[PDB]
């Protein structure tokens, strides 16, 4: 086995390489790389044990079903596309770059102005409105429900902790194990608790973003106010 090489056919447009068939034949040296010519044990034997009980038993793994439904569903045709969500490409608007001030449009933080840190692996944006400034923690948000303003701060050379991933921010639940019939309420735990790890991470990011916010004048006051529509102005006439 040889070491895998790079593509050697740079893509100039999606689906088209820069070099032709003959050009790639020579780049690959296909003239000298010409070739002419040259499992899973379903059953396992095991010592059963016992006098005159036979030597062993040919035990087959994955036994046959012991019940069949009255009818089944035919299998699907093949689709040659339709990748799972974890393999989708993640697209981010050109107006959203790290350090950009965003405006939240939905949720309990409606209309607040927050700072954009990174896009996460699922395409969700990681935002912090410095929790001291507007009570928005390190939180995920969707780029389709934010407004990217033109005001930006340089958050380069700041360290967003590595464990701040989608699995970190994914919600957790209790109900309803060991309990089927609902007569005693399982409404306990509903008070979601801020993990001490979350407080540590919030303190770490803010300690190095807040100083850069304080650098230029009255940005903390800007982050501290909320966005609203006044009867004079209209969103299509506004420059963000």
């Amino acid at each position: 086995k040889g070491k895998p090489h790079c593509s050697r056919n740079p893509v100039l447009v999606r689906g088209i390489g820069r070099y032709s068939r003959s050009a790639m034949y020579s780049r690959k040296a296909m003239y000298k790389r010409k070739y002419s010519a040259a499992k899973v044990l379903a059953t396992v034997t095991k010592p059963v044990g016992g006098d005159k009980n036979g030597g062993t038993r040919v035990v087959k793994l994955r036994k046959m079903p012991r019940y069949y439904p009255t009818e089944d569903v035919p299998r699907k045709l093949l689709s040659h596309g339709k990748k799972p969500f974890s393999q989708h490409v993640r697209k981010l608007r050109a107006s959203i770059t790290p350090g950009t001030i965003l405006i939240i449009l939905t949720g309990r933080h409606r209309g607040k102005r927050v700072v954009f840190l990174k896009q996460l692996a699922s395409g969700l944006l990681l935002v912090t409105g410095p929790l001291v400034l507007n009570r928005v923690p390190l939180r995920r948000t969707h780029q389709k429900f934010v407004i990217a303003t033109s005001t930006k701060i340089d958050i380069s050379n700041v360290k967003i902790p590595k464990h701040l991933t989608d699995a970190y921010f994914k919600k957790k639940k209790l109900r309803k194990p060991r309990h089927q019939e609902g007569e005693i309420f399982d409404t306990e735990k509903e008070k979601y608790e801020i993990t001490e790890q979350r407080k540590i991470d919030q303190k770490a990011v803010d300690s190095q973003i807040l100083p850069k916010i304080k650098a230029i004048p009255q940005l903390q006051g800007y982050l501290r106010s909320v966005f609203a529509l006044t009867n004079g102005i209209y969103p299509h006439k506004l420059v963000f």
């Binding site: 439904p69 009255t70 009818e71 089944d72 569903v73």
Partner: protein
Amino acid sequence: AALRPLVKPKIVKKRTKKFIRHQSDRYVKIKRNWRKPRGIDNRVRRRFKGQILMPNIGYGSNKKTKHMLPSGFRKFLVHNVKELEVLLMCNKSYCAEIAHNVSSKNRKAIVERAAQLAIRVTNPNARL
């Protein structure tokens, strides 16, 4: 809880309202049962706008979901336990229902047997 059908496609109904007979609203003697208007000057037959619509084959339901109950099953009328076992191998596509004339004592046995054979009954609690 209830027995589920093999597949539950989305049932699309082209029309959800009945085709009422022309002028059945103006007369008691004329019932809502559809009758094709054949008068020489009838504006419903001529299909003038804003009039009572006429049934035609274009309103036909999809053959995949025709005669399908809202529960995704199709119904087979049964009169005794013996007719119930024809649905043993059609459990997940066809549901039984008991005829109106069946006695209270006898439909108890039908419901009991259908629970055993995993056949769904549309009227399991019907005389009690």
